[PDB]
Symmetry: D2
């Protein structure tokens, strides 16, 4: 296409409307180099650990962007502070490859990222990262499956870009993704059925055997959060990884799995809660803390929230 | 970097047929299918920037006819069997589903091409009767998975070998030789949204997986919603995949000739079982080319565990 | 490679040292999208004019960069003035695909570009483009052959970047290309032998039948300027498209063939002359004017210049 | 977009051999060479980010042996002919230059793989004598050009057909069928740096091209410096390519079996001539596998014009 709207062109025209300095546009450009290199890695991870390579890649592209200052990783015990010479205004919380272990089974996987603005005047620190997802200025994920898709939520909307592997560019294919109000699928690991707390268990039963003599929901569960959430966004439904006695505080980490997705969901008109509060309004105390998460089409998450407080 | 001794699928099937006194035909047929799979991998990968199953159908059909190795072809997109024109005939029957789950591309779930090849057992004019052979008589069967990578998994008389598309040279490269499934698995795959209508055998097996009597950890649940996806997962990691019958689909959903039987043959050659609940899928005699069948496949002990539950429920 | 120096990372670190605004870095990034799309086009221009597509591509990526204001093309009669809303500080003179007609024969071909800074305060105009190549702030070419190579000359040096088609990125492979002083090849279309002016003709004879009983020069001539010049830069030699009675003012255009190459050559320690003056010191009056050009390793161009004024 | 009726090289050679009662061998051999060409195209394209001719040699040799279609192989990188082991033998002789002009990669000039395939004419044990056949006895011959695109040009008994690598599906696609060269050309290709030592026949032809007696426009000069480059140019656009002898290379530079003869056979099947100046290259009897020969090929009238100059100079 002769005037292809690339992710660069898209982000660039939006930063220009803020009368900014281009650090966002630098950032997402670097992150895109990481994403292409990792898609290429996963498309041949078989012909002859991987998440370590993936991680050193994302840190390097992000430091060299001259746009970050604190970086928090799935893979790193502490926050990494960008050297003064390369420091810039943003904080990035990211998981470089959620569920790497799934590549043997060829399950679609992805990089999840969340970006905050450091607001304080003192030295870069983990505190800058300990912010509520409600204050993210941008977020999204790149999914490596049949095709590589980068979905990006900013103040203006949720947009989806596809990698064109010929020209090595992410091209804009869906503008202002809005989720369906009510959907027909429920995504959850039912093999934890005995560990679930009452509200979930009533809702599972309500969807399988619908009290209103309507259609039972379809069950789906890829087993990798990006695959499941992306399907929930494009098709509608509910996705849950609730607390259970094995994972009492949930399992997905708040700063780099839950808050990114929750932000993408809510920006598309979806909702995202823990059962007791909005995921995005949780204030983190540890950069690696977990959350219960339930997200998806609005009426569905709500139906569940009623069962939660018709049980409180 | 740049390997000199590359084992491509063509080189490996060639080293099979040659020692068994091949004719050059299996390889002609298979190299044709590989072009079709490459061509479908790419369009799927650019799907959203560019029906795809109709085009796939036409493609798979044209590359197959041109192999000079086919005579009858069955497709899920074609009512009647296609009999290849005389000039291009050869001895095999290829039953195939060109693009499994094509509904799911929008949500970027891995989908696949499934195929079964029979050898014609008659001195006659090709007709769809030649396709109506049971699973046990398959010469080769396999699938192509369009996922984070493109995997072709061929199962033929000695075993199952996985291949992966090297997108640089455009070749399927041998990555796993002589595969064998785990014996006992830890994953069960079934659409529990249909839970209100399952037969009581299934209903107990699922609850046994969830709430184990003998205080084991429950089995995990996984269900991508694309048969190829869930089968490959079942083959590499083990477990059990169940698409049993429910009254709303009274004799199952999955079609016997080009979906159930290819998977059943790939499973059994890896040491798994594939049954409908009553009999081995591979011994059902096909009566209509688009006939349907319930299928349960997976790790031998898990299949068997569900069978004992079926036996005590009859 | 986990910390790949991409053309973006290279240009970005250099603009940062000027305390600039990033328009250069925007520019070369957009130009790179054009170059990848055209390499992809040429790598299948056969499976089933092209230079028209190539041109609309380069103009579009360049306007959307918010970094240009006058664009001069091989293919356009007049200079194109960037709309106010997308205007920026640079001028780009470019040939989107020198020798397109050579793709039938599979001769390596390329995009040549030259960038000036508009220095005046008045409205953008062709005058801003009518500058001497000596004042280019950057220049180079992308070559589409066996591999796609972008060679870029800036105030700091000549560097060569190769496109890695897996990750869709130009990677830095040669830093500070310096040309050889004296080389062993002479590149010229000898089928014009009767049309050549005396100095050339003495020099051709001196290289074939060397008076010092030394080795005769090897002749080479691909027939596409980028192929020939790139070889001259990497291997050393002399390349000439002199004036001849068919082409009395030369044939290559000054603003988008000769001045870019001349600038790349001189920045690598090469020289580039018309026989009477340095190509880069010529002051253009028409944006589509031609020049005689003779460029290559220094001692060789000089040897020829002595024959020119041992004939003046 | 996404074509359903893709004519790949495998499909086209298959439609040749089948009507002529093939054995499945030419196609086995050729599909092997295509993998080698794909693998060499990519490494060349990433050459500067990554000897390449040694690896190419090994690659071409392993893919060829595995075709079950070869018995003797001659390479410019190997002194003696390689005789394929018994298990993998078949009827053909492939003489090949794995990476012509590999010196030139640094300067990013298009280079190529050249190959000739003979059919063994003896009931004997394979030996390099089987390779010492003259050009006229070639069954198929061609080249692969690694340029702005990857072009494979196969010449076989009926004509020459160009194919182009579609980097998406990784297949060589038929783009020009039944090629024929122009009869009179306008380009002569020769390294005039060697001008001090050419034989007087050449010296007049070049001056006739430059300074035409009959007041035509002079011929243009073009010389890439890679034989494949200049040959393909000569085939598609016409003209004459001359690598004659000079005393400093007294019997020419280009080796007869795997460079001169493949080009000579591709030229003649397109209606061009290839001579040394005295005789047609295709009738010289090879005596050493690495023997050399002068070659002049190109458009029939231009070749002939230089020959009349050779006849009146003897
Ligand atoms: O191992 P990661 O990188 O944390 O990702 C795995 C995650 O963990 C979930 C699977 O957990 P269960 O098997 O407990 O459902 C996936 O859906 C998520 O991607
Ligand atoms: O209809 P298709 O193209 O066969 O794809 C969907 C199929 O239907 C199954 C899932 O259906 P449910 O939603 O009934 O589980 C998949 O395993 C199969 O691929
Ligand atoms: O047609 P373009 O795009 O101007 O490019 C052709 C140029 O013209 C030269 C060829 O001219 P001659 O055949 O006169 O040497 C090439 O070297 C140059 O690339
Ligand atoms: O030595 P190679 O690998 O055969 O490559 C260079 C060869 O040598 C010829 C050019 O040599 P000159 O410099 O003598 O013209 C080319 O046509 C041939 O490819
Ligand atoms: Mg994770
Ligand atoms: Mg199907
Ligand atoms: Mg030009
Ligand atoms: Mg050679």
């Amino acid at each position: 296409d002769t005037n292809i709207v690339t992710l660069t062109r898209f982000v660039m025209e939006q930063g220009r409307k803020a009368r900014g300095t281009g650090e966002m546009t630098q950032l997402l450009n670097s992150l895109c180099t990481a994403v292409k290199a990792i898609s290429t890695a996963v498309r041949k991870a078989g012909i002859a650990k991987l998440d370590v390579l993936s991680n050193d890649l994302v840190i390097n592209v992000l430091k060299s962007s001259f746009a970050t200052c604190v970086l928090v990783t799935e893979e790193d015990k502490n926050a990494i502070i960008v050297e003064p010479e390369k420091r810039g205004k943003y904080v990035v919380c990211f998981d470089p490859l959620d569920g790497s272990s799934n590549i043997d089974c060829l399950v679609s996987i992805g990089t999840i990222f969340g970006i905050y603005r450091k607001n304080s005047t003192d030295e870069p620190s983990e505190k800058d990262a300990l912010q509520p997802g409600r204050n993210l200025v941008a977020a999204g994920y790149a999914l490596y499956g049949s095709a590589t898709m980068l979905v990006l939520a900013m103040v203006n909307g949720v947009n989806c870009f596809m990698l064109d592997p010929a020209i090595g560019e992410f091209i804009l294919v869906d503008r202002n993704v809005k989720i369906k109000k009510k959907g027909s699928i429920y995504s959850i690991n039912e093999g934890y059925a005995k560990e679930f707390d009452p509200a979930i268990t009533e809702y599972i039963q309500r969807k399988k055997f619908p009290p209103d003599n309507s259609a039972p929901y379809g069950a789906r569960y890829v087993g990798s959060m990006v695959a499941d959430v992306h399907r929930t966004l494009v098709y509608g439904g509910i996705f849950m990884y609730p607390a259970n006695k094995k994972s009492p505080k949930g399992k997905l980490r708040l700063l780099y799995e839950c808050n990114p997705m929750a932000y993408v969901m809510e920006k598309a008109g979806g909702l995202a809660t823990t059962g007791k509060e909005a995921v995005l309004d949780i204030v983190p105390t540890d950069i690696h803390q977990r959350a219960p998460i339930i997200l998806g089409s609005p009426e569905d998450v709500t139906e569940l929230l009623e069962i939660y407080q018709k049980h409180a």
